Design a protein around this ligand. Sequence first.
Ligand SMILES: NCCCC(=O)N[C@@H]1Cc2ccccc2[C@@H]1Cc1ccc2c(c1C(=O)O)OCO2
Ligand SMILES: NCCCC(=O)N[C@@H]1Cc2ccccc2[C@@H]1Cc1ccc2c(c1C(=O)O)OCO2
Lengths: 149, 149
Amino acid sequence: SPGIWQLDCTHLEGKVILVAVHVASGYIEAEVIPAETGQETAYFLLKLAGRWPVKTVHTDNGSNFTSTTVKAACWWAGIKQEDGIPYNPQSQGVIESMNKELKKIIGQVRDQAEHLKTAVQMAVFIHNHKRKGYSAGERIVDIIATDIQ
Amino acid sequence: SPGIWQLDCTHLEGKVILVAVHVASGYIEAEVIPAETGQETAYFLLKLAGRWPVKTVHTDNGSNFTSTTVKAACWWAGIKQEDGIPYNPQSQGVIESMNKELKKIIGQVRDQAEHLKTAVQMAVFIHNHKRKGYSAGERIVDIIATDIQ
Ligand SMILES: NCCCC(=O)N[C@@H]1Cc2ccccc2[C@@H]1Cc1ccc2c(c1C(=O)O)OCO2
Ligand SMILES: NCCCC(=O)N[C@@H]1Cc2ccccc2[C@@H]1Cc1ccc2c(c1C(=O)O)OCO2
């Protein structure tokens, strides 16, 4: 559980926002890309796994699950690649809710940035710092620190 | 101390590698950019501060310290921008040593990646996971978790 992440791909302004959510905390990292490809997904996962202890990734769709480039990145980084089938059905809804909420925040900051990528990183910041009490950033650190100990 | 980061800019293959080091742990994040500009530095800091609780940044040079765009990012993200003058002289040497070491790792992985950016992220991964015993990734999580508590 400390090591479980979920990929999520959402669309805005004709572009793609690729998101990794740390399932137990709600903490996210995100990037804007022109389109979701295996190469983009592979690179994003490499970045993520260098920054946090990523043990398992629930991939967002079958194309990324199948991608030989994504499989290579997961092998390289020591990530177990799993499907993202919401056997637990409240998973879909939790992600749909996060996407709506991310887009809401993006809209709230959108006029402060010339470029979408900047607004997305502003939204990541706001999301990870928001107290709900702990923030997602606080929860992920506590979860992993408990695991190490 | 849990919130103190240092910027560092180094050169390879005609490109620039921008690094943020968490001073107390040795943990890093890095990116490849064509050249160090205020805009690139500002965006990098926004990404960093959305991912970790960045309180203070020792900027890498006076151009970034002066940059109105960097100042805007630091204001937005709640970062105190400081100079990077190594009043303590072992700071310079510690960074020089990190740059040499990062470049060493990059050379060790370089043939596994078509693009420099990929090799740099591989190097970030190896650096943050290397046990020295704890790893830098373990130390940063423990430091911040102790601070929260
Ligand atoms: N020399 C052939 C490369 C070997 C190969 O296919 N996999 C690599 C091993 C590996 C391991 C982890 C992550 C990436 C990669 C690499 C793939 C790759 C994917 C995406 C990218 C890339 C490159 C890149 O190659 O830099 O660049 C930006 O987005
Ligand atoms: N409407 C213009 C006002 C913007 C302005 O001056 N500062 C912003 C506030 C702010 C606050 C934090 C980070 C960036 C920014 C922005 C600047 C910026 C810088 C670098 C970038 C950018 C943009 C961008 O604007 O997206 O894009 C990719 O690299």
